[model samples]
Structure formats: C-alpha cells, structure tokens
Target: VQPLATQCFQLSNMFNPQTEEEVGWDTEIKDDVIEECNKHGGVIHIYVDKNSAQGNVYVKCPSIAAAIAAVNALHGRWFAGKMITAAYVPLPTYHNLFPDSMTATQLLVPSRR
Candidate 1:
C-alpha cells in the first residue's frame, strides 16, 4: 500500500509563462490551482515550478485516494483556455524535480524580493 503522506499529483500545461511580465501572474495562478484542488481533499502542499518547460504544478494530498480522485477529476480539464494534464507522481521523482531551497509554503507565498 502507498503511504498517505507521499500521495502527490502532477498537473501540466497550467501556467507556462515565457516572459518576465508573465511571471507576475504566479500568485494568482497558484491561488487558482489551490482553490480547484482543495475540493478533492486537504491540500497539504503544492509546488509550482515556473522554471519548468511544462509549467508543472505538484499537489500533495493527505492520502493516495484523494490524489487518485484529483487526477481523475483534473486530467484533461481546461484551465485558462489550456488543456490541463494530470498524473500521479512518485515521491522520489517529485523530490528530484523540485529540490528547492524554499519550503512548499514559502514557495507558494508571493516573494517580496
């Protein structure tokens, strides 16, 4: 059985900003993702990799069941006129993809600098 804490999902094609001006939309984008994801379960953590080519959004849920439900509901859904893709992310793979110095909460917060 998969551990509850490690349950996470990857959302793609959500927000791939190509310019500095577009990066300013990060906070709003994250908020939109959180609001939508919260309906499926308690959103424990979320990481949006603006640097990634696909504009990946990683959402960590409280349980595998919730993660599965999120994928089922979110995959192929349209967001901001773009087709969103969702998939289950293994714990190790997630960590490798986003080994940021900042914590997930810190990453979500709007940076002052």
Candidate 2:
C-alpha cells in the first residue's frame, strides 16, 4: 500500500574513458551531466563509475516528473560522439548496479592533484 521511491534515470554512452589519464575526465563529465540535468529538475544525487567499461551515468532527480523530463530530453542525444540512451531505473536497482561507484558529491570535491 506504500508508494515506491522515485526512480533514477540511467544515461549510457555518454562517456567511457579507459585510461588513467582519461579517468580524470569523469569529474568534468559528471559536472556537465549535473548542469544539464539541473535544468529539468534539481538533482538529488548522481553517480559515475571511476573505473572503465561501465559507462553508464545515473541521475536521481527530485521527482518522477523530473525523471521523465530528463529521459525525454536526454535520450538519443549525442554526447562525446556517442548517442546517449536514457531510461528509468528503480531506486533500489540503481544502488545495486553501482555499489562501488562514487557519488557526485564525493567526485565533485577538490582532489589532491
């Protein structure tokens, strides 16, 4: 009888860097995603894999309305020479998918470079 939590959106093909040098770009990519997503609705949380291969970006919006709007606006969009594929993902599933990934809050912090 209880409603489920708002689902997050999964955005793939946005960025997938395979080198240590390129990995540094994740922060920038995450920032760009946050900026774009903010226009639809304020982001609650975001995730991007620090390692390679799992190129998906996860965005948690404030509401289901925002999630749908983000998917509609971002899906099929070209990003970094790749067509982004966006889809809704259940909140629990999103966390399960990236248990080790870093959150936007953590990744956006200044690094000891």
Candidate 3:
C-alpha cells in the first residue's frame, strides 16, 4: 500500500523563469525541495507530472507532521520568481493485479449443506 494519506502534500503556482531554456522539473527545483524537506527528516518521495504543464508538484513526507511542516514552509513562498502554494492532497494507490491471475486463486473449503 502507498502512504498517500496525511503524509502527502501538493505544491502549486510554481514556474520556471527560463521556460524556453528547459523543462520546469529541472534539478534546481528538486534540489531546493530536497534541501527544505531535509530539515524535517527528508521526503519519502516526490512526483511531477511530466505530461502536464501545470507545474503541479506532489511530495510524500515521512509523517503527517513533516507534511504539515512542508506546507507551512512552502505555502505562499517565492520560488523561481513565483509565489508557490502548498496544500494537503492525498495521493491515489494503484494495484498491479490482473483479473486472470486472480481468477486462478480461490479459497479451499467445503460448505456444509
């Protein structure tokens, strides 16, 4: 199971000044985030939708407290010339099981008539 509940937070309003130079998800943004998150036991993981150009960022912290701290530290903060916003956003869990594989398994027990 993924820890996407209270430990998760989303960042918005982020942008890269040099948009033509490169993608917004460059190392600088990640490094800055890592540095800030490291103050509170570091981040469990970080995700930025490569397919979307909305500049949405998701961060999974080690705990709820860390998540809160990240929001407090990052919300309404200036980064890359834009005021970034942070908020709590639970992530979704993905299961990798197939229907055919599941159909092959069953409980072995005789029912009493």
Candidate 4:
C-alpha cells in the first residue's frame, strides 16, 4: 500500500515558503520525521509538484493512526484548505506515482523551477 495520504499531505505544501521560513521539511524536519516513521516501520518518499516546494514526504507509519498523527503534526499553512491522507509503503519503491494535479498556485517569488 502506498502512503498517498502522507504523500499528498507533504506535496500539498510544495509551494510553501518553508525554505524561506527556515522550518522546511527538507532542511529541518527531514530526518526527524523520516526517522520517526522508519523507527515505527514506515518509509518516506519525496516528490515534486506544482508547489515548487520540492516533493512528497510519503510516510508509511507503523499504523494508520500513527500515520495520520505524523502527517497532522507537520500540517501547516503550506496546504491551505487541503486534506491529509495515510497509507503503507516503502520510500524508494515508488519513484513516479505522483498525481497529475495542476491546480496549485504558481507564484514567482521562488519561481517554479
């Protein structure tokens, strides 16, 4: 099972200015969150989307509730009005399973790369 919920939740903030905010997942909370998932038998995958924020943090927590809580704890304004999901899978297994959603805001501050 794929952690689409975790992936979508992480991707939802693709454009979030966390990098600028200095609280970004990649730079700050990367290992902490990923380690937590791994320690509990979950894996994380990274994916890039319209957010230009980078990619998904697909987390396969030990259980559904843990996964939900993991994703929820990281929830921020990165994904305004976005819903979180959950699942179970490995990070390296899925390399190209992102959604074709082109409905994200394309701002030019950091610019879409």
In terms of TM-score, the best-performing candidate is 1
What lDDT tens digits, residue by residue, belong to model 2 across residues 44-65? 6776765436467777765677
Cα lDDT for residue 46, candidate 3: 62
Clash number for each model: 0, 0, 0, 9
**Better-scoring candidate (TM-score), 1 or 2:** 1
Q: Where does candidate 4 clash, by residue pair? A: 5-85, 5-86, 14-51, 14-53, 15-51, 42-60, 47-55, 47-56, 48-55
Candidates 1 and 3 compared: the better one by TM-score is: 1
The weakest ten consecutive residues by lDDT in model 4 span 104-113
Writing each residue's lDDT as its tens digit, candidate 4 over 2-100 gives: 435432234233334444444343533345455444444343343333244443444333235555655555544234445433233443443245332
Give the per-residue lDDT of model 1 (tens digit) for 73-94. Answer: 8877887778888767667767
Alpha-carbon shift of residue 2 in model 1 (angstroms) = 13
- The TM-scores of all predictions, comma-separated, are 0.67, 0.66, 0.62, 0.32
lDDT of each: 0.65, 0.63, 0.57, 0.40
Ranking by lDDT: 1, 2, 3, 4
What's the best-to-worst order under TM-score?
1, 2, 3, 4
